[PDB]
RNA sequence: GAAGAUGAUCAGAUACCGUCGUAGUCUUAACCAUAAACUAUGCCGACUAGGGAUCGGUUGUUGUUCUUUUAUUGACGCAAUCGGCACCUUACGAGAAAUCAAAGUCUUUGGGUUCUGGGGGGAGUAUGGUCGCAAGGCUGAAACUUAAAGGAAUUGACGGAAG
C-alpha cells in the first residue's frame, strides 16, 4: 500500500523519484536550471 | 500475493480487537507469529492462544481480553543498531513509560527492554502497547 | 471558447507553420 | 442462583402457548438466533419458551431493584399494547407513556411532561425506536419485548416474544408484572393466585 | 370563508371541559351561559365562542370528540377499562383442555420437560 | 497513577466495560449501569444488594449488549442455559 | 436564586453530590450549569475568537456574532463552548454556559520519573475536527507549552505544564482548531494503560444511594 | 458533484450498449438509459364503443387492443412530463409510483 | 447524411426547422492509435456489519405441474455452499463535503508493487527527436504573466423549469 516502494533494497527507486519529482518544484528548477543567472535582467545579483 | 504472515496475523488481531471481540482465527501460522504471539502474552496483552494443526501452514486462534491498544508489523525488517533504538520507541510508542517494540536479534525475538538489558540488537519486527 | 474549440483553432493555426516553414526546410 | 420454584411452570407454558407467544417471525435477525427453537416449514420462527421466561424473571429483577418504583417508565406506541402498560403502571407503580411518545420526553428538561426514568421498558424496538433513542442520550438501560425481526441496538434486556399478536403483549406484560409484585412481596408467595385476570392488559376493539 | 381561529376554539373546548352538564344543544341557552361563565371583552367574540360551543356540543352527542375531556366521559371510559370477563380467553376450556400447537411446538414442549395433553 | 513517594495522583479511577474492558468515558450517554436484583430462597428480593453490571455506548449501540448481558448473567448463575458458548 | 430541574441538580443543591468526578465516574448527563458552578468554585474563562456571519435575504444580510469561550480551573478541568447570538455580549454569556456545561476530566501524566505532581500528559492523544487534527505529545519538565496561542490558551486552562503540539489542515479556522484541542485533551482518561489494569467494583450511582432526596 | 450513483442509466457489469431513437425527436439515446413506457389501449376511444357495438355484423365482438412500447430521451421525456424532476431524497425512490 | 444546394425564420443568420444531397455510412485487404476509451476510483493479498434478490456450478430435500401409472423426465418449491453482475440498511470507521462495504483497518501514521500531481495561465505551445501516406500520435520546455483559479455545501435571488 501507499504506492512507494517500500522494499529494504529499494533505495535506487526512492532516491531517483524523489530526484524527478522535485523538478516540479518551481524553487528548486529555477535554481538548477540557472534561470537567475542565463535570463534575469540582473543577472542574478541584488543591485544593478 | 501473500508476503508477510506476521502483518496478516496483526492485522487481523487488531480488527478483531477493536470490534469488541474476545478471540480471533490466524492462518497461516508461523514461528515468528507465535514468538511474536508469546512476547504480547507474556506482557499481559492478550490471553492464551492455541495452535490448530493441520498438516499444513497451521492456524491458531488467539483469546483477547481488552488491554490491547495497537500491535503491529514495521515492514521493512528495518536494520537497527544499539543507539537507533531510541528513535525507534520515540516514533512509535505512546508514552516512555509503557509500550514495546519487538525486535528479532541473533539472541532470538524480544521486546527492546529486553534487548537493552542484554545488550542486543538486530532488526526491528513490530510493536505493541 | 468551449475547451474543444481552441483546440480545433490550434490544430489549424499549426498546421500553417508546418506550410510557412515548409517553404524552407 | 435461583431456586428450583423460579422454573417454568406447566400453567405458564400453557398460558404461553395458547396465545401463539412462540410464534415468531418469517426472517430472524443474527442476534436473535439463539432465541429461535426450529423454523415450521410453513416459514414462522418456533421462539424456545423456556428462554422467554429466564428473560421475564430477569427483567422483572432489574425492574425490581429500581429503589422508587415511579423511575420505570413502560411504553407502547402499538395499539395493541397500551392498555398492558397502563395496567402494568397501575399494579406496579410505574410511569406509563401509551401513544404517541413526545420527542423530547428525556431530553428536553423544560417540556411539561419531562421525565428521568432509571429504566425503561418498550413493547416493540420499532414502533418504539424513538424512546429507545433518546434512552441512548441519556444513559437509561432499556428492556424490550422482542420478536424474531426486532432490532436490537440500544436494546440491554430482550424479552423474546411475539409482539405483533394481540394475546401475547397482554401475556408478556401480566407475566412482568405478577414477577415484580412476587419479588417485592405484594403478592405474598409464588404458588397463591393472583386477583387479576390476563384479560385485564388485554386490548379491545371500541364496539366489543 | 368561514374557520373559526383559535381563540373561539380553545375557549369552547375550556368551557366544555369544566362546564358540560349545565350546557346545552341551544345557541340561546349558551349564550347566556357563556356571558355569566366567561370574561369575554365583546359581544362577537362572546356569540363566536357559544356557537362554537354549540357545534362541539351537538357533535358530542353522536360520539366522542378529540381534544376535549369532561369529568363523565372520562369515568365512564374508567369504568369500561376495569372490565374483566368472567371467563377466561387463556383459559384452556375453550379448546377442551387440549392445544392445537403443531408437531414442532409439540416437540418444544416435550423438550422443556412438559408432558402437557396437546 | 501516582508519584514516587506512592501517592495516587489521579483523580476519578473510571470504570470499564464488563463485556469489552474499554473505559467507560465521562461523556458516553449511551453507557448504563446495570443493577440486578439478588433473590432469596424464600423469593423475595433483598434490599440493597445488587449485582450490577456497565457496558459502553459501543456495544450497546452495535445490538450486542443483549447477548452481553446473556453471557455475565449467565456465569454469574443469575441465568441457566439460554447462552451457548457453542456457534 | 436557583431551583432545579434534574435530578442531579436537586441532588447537587443538597450537599450530597460533593465532587465533579461522582458526575463523571457515572457518565451523567448535566444540563444545568449551576451544577457546575456549585462543584467548581474556581473556574476562569477566556474569549478565543468572535466571527460575524451572515445570511443572505431578500432585504440583505443579517449579521450574527459568533463566541468561542474557553473555561478551566488549571488544575485537570476543562471545557468549550461556542455559540452565537444578535449581540456579541450575549453571544459571549450563552458560550459560557455552554462551555460549563462541557466540562471534562484531563488525566495528567509524567515524561518519565514520577518525581512531584504529574506535569505533562500519560500519552500521545489526537483529535480531529474539520479539516484540522491537532496531536499532543508529552514533553519533558522543563518545557512550556510548545504550541499556537489558542492551544497554549487550552492547555493552560487544563492545567497542563508540559506539552509538545503537531496541527495539520486549516488551523486557521479557530473553532476546528480549538474543537479538536478539546477532543485530544480529552482522550487522556480514553487511553488505557497498564497501570489501569485493574478491575474496580462497579460503585453504586449516587442517584441511587439518593433517591429520595433526588425526587423533587 | 455526481448526481446519481447509476450514473442515469442501468449499465452495470457491460462495456456499451446500442441506441434507441427517440420517439420524439429521433435522437439516439442508450437502451438503458432510455424511458420506456408499456402501453395497452383500446383500439376504439370509450365514447365510440357503443356506436361501433350497434354497427357490428357480430354480436359479441371482442373488440382489439392496441400495444406498443414507447422510448424517449430525457429531454423529451421531461417536456412531455412522462417523469418530472423530483426531490434529492424522492430520486432514489425506484419502485413505480400508483 | 459532414460539404454543398435550397425553402423558411430573423435586424442579420452562410444556424436551429423543411427539402435535396457529395464524402461517409457497409465489405475485403492495409493504415491510423485516439474518446467524458468513466466506476472520472491501478493491480495482487488479508481483515472488518446486517439484509433480501439474482446468474453459473455443485450438494441435500416437496401440500407443486407434467412424462406416463410411476424411475435415471423435466419444470417449479425448500435449504446449503463456492464463483459473479448488482442492490438495500447502518455508519463502528472514513471524509471538506457530496458521499463511501470501501473512498474502512491512515499522526495509534509501514502487507507487496506500478504509474501520476505539486497555485492559475503561457501550453500540451515552441524547439529537437521519433512514428505516420496524410490527418495526426508520442516525447516535450522556457521567457513572460498573475492573486487567486478551483472543490463541496449554505442562505437568498433569478430561471423562455416543475407543482
Ligand atoms: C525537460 N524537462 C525534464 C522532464 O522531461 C523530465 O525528464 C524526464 C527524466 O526525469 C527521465 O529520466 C529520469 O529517470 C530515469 C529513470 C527511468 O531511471 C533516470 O535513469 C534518469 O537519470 C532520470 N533523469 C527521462 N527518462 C525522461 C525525461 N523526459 O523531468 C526532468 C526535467 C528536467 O524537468
Ligand atoms: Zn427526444
Given at each position: 500500500g501507499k504506492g512507494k516502494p517500500r522494499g529494504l533494497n529499494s533505495a535506487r527507486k526512492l532516491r531517483v523519484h524523489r530526484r524527478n519529482n522535485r523538478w516540479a518544484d518551481q524553487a528548486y528548477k529555477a535554481r538548477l536550471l540557472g534561470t537567475a543567472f542565463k535570463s534575469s535582467p540582473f543577472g542574478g545579483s541584488s543591485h544593478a | 500475493t501473500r508476503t508477510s504472515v506476521l502483518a496478516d496475523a496483526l492485522n487481523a488481531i487488531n480488527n478483531a480487537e477493536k470490534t469488541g471481540k474476545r478471540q480471533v482465527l490466524i492462518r497461516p501460522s508461523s514461528k515468528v507469529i507465535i514468538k511474536f504471539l508469546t512476547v504480547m502474552q507474556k506482557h499481559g496483552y492478550i490471553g492464551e492462544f492455541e495452535y490448530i494443526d493441520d498438516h499444513r501452514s497451521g492456524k491458531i486462534v488467539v483469546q483477547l481480553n481488552g488491554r490491547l491498544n495497537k500491535c503491529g508489523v514495521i515492514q521493512p525488517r528495518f536494520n537497527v543498531k544499539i543507539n537507533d533504538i531510541e528513535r525507534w520507541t520515540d516514533n512509535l510508542?505512546?508514552?516512555?513509560?509503557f509500550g514495546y517494540v519487538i525486535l528479532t536479534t541473533s539472541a532470538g525475538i524480544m521486546d527492546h527492554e529486553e534487548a537493552r538489558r542484554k545488550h542486543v540488537s538486530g532488526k526491528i519486527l513490530g510493536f505493541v502497547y | 471558447m468551449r475547451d474543444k474549440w481552441r483546440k480545433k483553432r490550434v490544430r489549424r493555426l499549426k498546421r500553417k507553420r508546418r506550410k510557412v516553414r515548409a517553404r524552407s526546410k | 442462583s435461583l431456586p428450583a420454584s423460579f422454573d417454568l411452570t406447566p400453567e405458564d407454558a400453557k398460558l404461553l402457548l395458547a396465545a401463539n407467544v412462540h410464534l415468531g417471525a418469517k426472517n430472524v435477525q443474527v442476534h436473535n438466533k439463539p432465541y429461535v427453537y426450529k423454523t415450521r416449514p410453513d416459514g414462522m420462527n418456533i421462539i424456545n419458551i423456556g428462554k422467554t421466561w429466564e428473560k421475564i424473571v430477569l427483567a422483572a429483577r432489574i425492574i425490581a431493584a429500581v429503589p422508587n418504583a415511579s423511575d420505570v417508565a413502560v411504553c407502547s406506541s402499538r395499539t395493541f399494547g397500551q392498555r398492558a402498560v397502563l395496567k402494568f403502571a397501575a399494579h406496579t407503580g410505574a410511569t406509563a407513556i401509551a401513544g404517541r411518545f413526545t420527542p423530547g420526553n428525556f431530553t428536553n428538561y423544560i417540556t411539561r411532561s419531562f421525565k428521568e426514568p432509571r429504566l425503561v421498558v418498550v413493547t416493540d424496538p420499532r414502533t418504539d425506536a424513538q424512546a429507545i433513542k433518546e434512552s441512548s442520550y441519556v444513559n437509561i438501560p432499556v428492556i424490550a419485548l422482542t420478536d424474531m425481526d426486532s432490532p436490537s441496538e440500544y436494546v440491554d434486556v430482550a424479552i423474546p416474544c411475539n409482539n405483533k399478536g394481540k394475546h401475547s403483549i397482554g401475556l408478556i406484560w401480566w407475566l412482568l408484572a405478577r414477577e415484580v409484585l412476587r419479588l417485592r412481596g405484594i403478592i405474598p408467595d409464588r404458588t397463591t393466585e393472583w386477583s387479576v385476570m390476563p384479560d385485564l392488559y388485554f386490548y379491545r376493539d371500541p364496539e366489543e | 370563508g368561514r374557520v373559526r381561529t383559535k381563540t373561539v376554539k380553545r375557549a369552547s373546548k375550556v368551557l366544555i371541559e369544566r362546564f358540560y352538564p349545565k350546557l346545552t344543544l341551544d345557541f340561546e341557552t349558551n349564550k347566556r351561559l357563556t356571558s355569566e361563565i366567561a370574561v369575554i371583552q365583546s359581544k362577537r367574540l362572546r356569540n363566536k365562542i357559544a356557537g362554537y360551543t354549540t357545534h362541539l356540543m351537538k357533535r358530542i352527542q353522536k360520539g366522542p370528540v378529540r381534544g376535549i375531556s369532561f369529568k363523565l366521559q372520562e369515568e365512564e371510559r374508567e369504568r369500561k377499562d376495569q372490565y374483566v370477563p368472567e371467563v377466561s380467553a387463556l383459559d384452556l376450556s375453550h379448546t377442551n383442555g387440549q392445544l392445537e400447537i403443531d408437531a414442532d411446538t409439540a416437540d418444544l414442549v416435550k423438550s422443556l420437560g412438559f408432558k402437557i395433553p396437546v | 497513577m501516582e508519584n514516587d513517594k506512592g501517592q495516587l495522583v489521579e483523580l476519578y479511577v473510571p470504570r470499564k466495560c464488563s463485556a469489552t474492558n474499554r473505559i467507560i468515558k465521562a461523556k458516553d450517554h449511551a453507557s448504563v449501569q446495570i443493577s440486578i436484583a439478588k433473590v432469596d430462597e424464600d423469593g423475595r428480593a433483598i434490599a440493597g444488594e445488587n449485582i450490577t453490571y456497565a457496558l459502553s455506548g459501543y456495544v450497546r449501540g452495535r445490538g450486542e449488549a443483549d447477548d452481553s448481558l446473556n453471557r455475565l448473567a449467565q456465569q454469574d448463575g443469575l441465568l441457566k442455559n439460554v447462552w451457548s458458548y457453542s456457534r | 436564586g436557583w431551583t432545579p430541574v434534574t435530578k442531579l441538580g436537586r441532588l447537587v443543591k443538597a450537599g450530597k453530590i460533593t465532587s465533579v468526578e461522582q458526575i463523571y465516574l457515572h457518565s451523567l448527563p448535566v444540563k444545568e450549569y449551576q451544577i457546575i458552578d456549585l462543584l467548581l468554585p474556581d473556574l476562569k474563562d477566556d474569549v478565543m475568537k468572535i466571527r460575524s456571519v451572515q445570511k443572505q435575504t431578500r432585504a440583505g444580510q443579517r449579521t450574527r456574532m459568533k463566541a468561542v469561550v474557553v473555561i478551566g480551573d488549571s488544575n485537570g478541568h476543562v471545557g468549550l463552548g461556542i455559540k452565537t447570538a444578535k449581540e456579541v455580549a450575549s453571544a459571549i454569556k450563552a458560550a459560557i454556559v455552554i462551555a460549563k456545561l462541557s466540562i471534562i476530566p484531563i488525566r495528567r501524566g509524567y515524561w518519565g520519573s514520577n518525581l512531584g505532581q504529574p506535569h505533562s500528559l500519560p500519552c500521545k492523544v489526537t483529535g480531529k475536527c474539520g479539516s484540522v487534527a491537532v496531536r499532543l505529545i508529552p514533553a519533558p519538565r522543563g518545557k512550556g507549552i510548545v504550541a499556537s496561542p489558542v492551544v497554549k490558551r487550552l492547555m493552560q486552562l487544563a492545567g497542563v505544564e508540559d506539552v509538545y503540539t503537531s496541527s495539520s489542515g486549516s488551523t486557521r479556522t479557530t473553532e476546528n482548531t480549538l474543537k479538536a484541542a478539546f477532543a485530544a485533551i480529552g482522550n487522556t482518561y480514553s487511553f488505557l494503560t497498564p497501570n489501569l489494569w485493574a478491575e474496580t467494583p462497579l460503585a453504586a450511582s449516587p442517584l441511587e444511594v439518593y433517591a429520595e432526596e433526588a425526587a423533587a | 458533484p455526481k448526481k446519481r450513483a447509476s450514473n442515469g442509466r442501468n449499465k452495470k457489469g457491460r462495456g456499451h450498449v446500442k441506441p434507441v431513437r427517440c420517439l420524439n425527436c429521433a435522437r439516439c439515446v442508450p437502451k438503458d438509459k432510455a424511458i420506456k413506457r408499456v402501453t395497452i389501449r383500446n383500439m376504439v376511444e370509450a365514447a365510440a364503443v357503443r356506436d361501433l357495438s350497434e354497427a357490428s355484423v357480430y354480436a359479441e365482438y371482442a373488440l382489439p387492443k392496441l400495444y406498443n412500447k414507447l422510448h424517449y430521451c430525457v429531454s423529451c421525456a421531461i417536456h412531455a412530463r412522462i417523469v418530472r424532476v423530483r426531490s434529492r431524497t424522492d430520486r432514489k425512490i425506484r419502485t413505480p409510483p400508483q
Open positions: - | 510508542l505512546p508514552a516512555r513509560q | - | - | - | - | - | -
